[PDB]
């Protein structure tokens, strides 16, 4: 019933400020709990960042305190993160989480409800939307190549979501150029190739790119 959702830019230039907002649903921040942020750089462990109470009282990770601000807006049931002077070390998935005070005597907090997380990449490179190419079938495998985009992520659906079974969307490769590419492939009955239309729907939010590419035999 309690849900948290992170939002904000997915790309920040080095030395600028990374800003995120967490919208809470199912519980009023004004009523209780601490509310805070945890991040995870790609392939690494969890790192706690900081938290805030509805009164405005905060706890900040000491190593980040000089660069950190956390704010709360009880009127909008949201709280926010600002991390200044960022570098590539700050590229990470950022989670917001409810911080529960333990009933034990000594002060203790644990994190019982988490948002899904949002990726922020720190880079000087410009946003670039993908070029989308059809991967024609010779059952049959067909797909779409989503080429040369930045930054992550990209979403792919098939037939506006009507086609889900047999879909395998692969994790992107990061090229030496600094751009990403990924592919999505679907396995379909060979029998259906003349009668069924197949379109991959590609969405790259950072560049506001929306591409529908029909894949023909």
């Amino acid at each position: 019933e309690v849900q948290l959702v992170e939002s904000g830019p997915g790309l920040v230039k080095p030395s600028d400020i990374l800003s995120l907002t967490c919208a809470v649903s199912g519980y009023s921040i004004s009523s209780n709990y601490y509310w805070g942020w945890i991040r995870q750089p790609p392939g690494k462990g969890l790192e706690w960042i900081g938290s805030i109470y509805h009164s405005g009282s905060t706890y900040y990770k000491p190593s980040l305190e000089s660069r950190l601000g956390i704010s709360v807006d009880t009127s909008k049931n949201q709280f926010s993160l600002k991390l200044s002077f960022v570098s590539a070390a700050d590229t990470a998935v950022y989670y917001c989480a409810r911080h529960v005070r333990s009933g034990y005597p000594d002060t203790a907090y644990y994190f019982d409800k988490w948002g899904q997380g949002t990726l922020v990449t720190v880079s000087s490179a410009s946003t670039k939307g993908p070029s989308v190419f059809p991967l024609a079938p010779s059952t049959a495998a067909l797909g779409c190549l989503v080429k040369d985009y930045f930054p992550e992520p990209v979403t792919v659906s098939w037939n506006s979501g009507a086609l889900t079974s047999g879909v395998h969307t692969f994790p992107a490769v990061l090229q030496s150029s600094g751009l990403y590419s990924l592919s999505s492939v679907v396995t379909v009955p060979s029998s259906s190739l003349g009668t069924q239309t197949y379109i991959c729907n590609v969405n790259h939010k950072p560049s506001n790119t929306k591409v529908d590419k029909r894949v023909e035999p």
Binding site: Q116, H168, S181
Partner: protein
């Protein structure tokens, strides 16, 4: 700052009991909490206050804490329990939360599975745009490592090759992909190109040719 030490990896046979340690100076004096994280998803609280379970967490998950080491115990381990597990405390002396470095749980006994390889040639559209990419998609393999080699006719090619790390498919098998960037002239001047995927000593090769 207070330090929590976890082993990077623990392996256990299915149905057996997995024990994941979390070491810290006098950790027994602090309450300890634990999280499970599946590749690609947010962590989930599985134990708090040393040994209590949130509603919905199976009774198979239990915790203990005394002296200089705490333990997450998972009884009757299932392949579905494969995940990274993190311990966590609140350090009162510095007002911050500390995590251990995480422990990856592996469940043994999973059968070897050879990769499925699908290789696509450059699209007409891409060739029209004066570029060419061969796409080698590799799926359903276990254990989770392959090596990929490309050939132009019979000549190994390394230039222009970009290959991903392996990723977990949630059916607990693994996937990866490899891309070969060519000029349209390179594509046209060979009879074929091959993507060769080696997995546990066995090579699966797929080949495409200009049509």
């Amino acid at each position: 700052s207070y330090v929590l030490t976890q082993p990077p990896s623990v392996s256990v046979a299915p149905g057996e009991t997995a024990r994941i340690s979390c070491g810290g100076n006098n950790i027994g004096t602090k309450v300890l909490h634990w999280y499970q994280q599946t590749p690609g998803q947010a962590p989930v609280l599985v134990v708090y206050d040393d040994s209590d379970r949130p509603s919905g967490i199976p009774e198979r998950f239990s915790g203990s804490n005394s002296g200089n080491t705490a333990t997450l115990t998972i009884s009757r381990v299932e392949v579905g329990d494969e995940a990274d597990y993190y311990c966590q405390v609140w350090d009162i002396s510095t007002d911050q939360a500390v995590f251990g470095g995480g422990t990856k749980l592996t469940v043994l006994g999973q059968p070897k599975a050879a990769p499925s390889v699908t290789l696509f040639p450059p699209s007409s559209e891409e060739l029209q745009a004066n570029k060419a990419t061969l796409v080698c998609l590799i799926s359903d393999f276990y254990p989770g490592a392959v090596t990929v080699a490309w050939k132009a006719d019979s000549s190994p090619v390394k230039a222009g090759v970009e290959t991903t790390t392996p990723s977990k498919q949630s059916n607990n098998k693994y996937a990866a992909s490899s891309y070969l960037s060519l000029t349209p002239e390179q594509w046209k001047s060979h009879r074929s190109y091959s993507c060769q995927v080696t997995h546990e000593g066995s090579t699966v090769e797929k080949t495409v040719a200009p049509t």
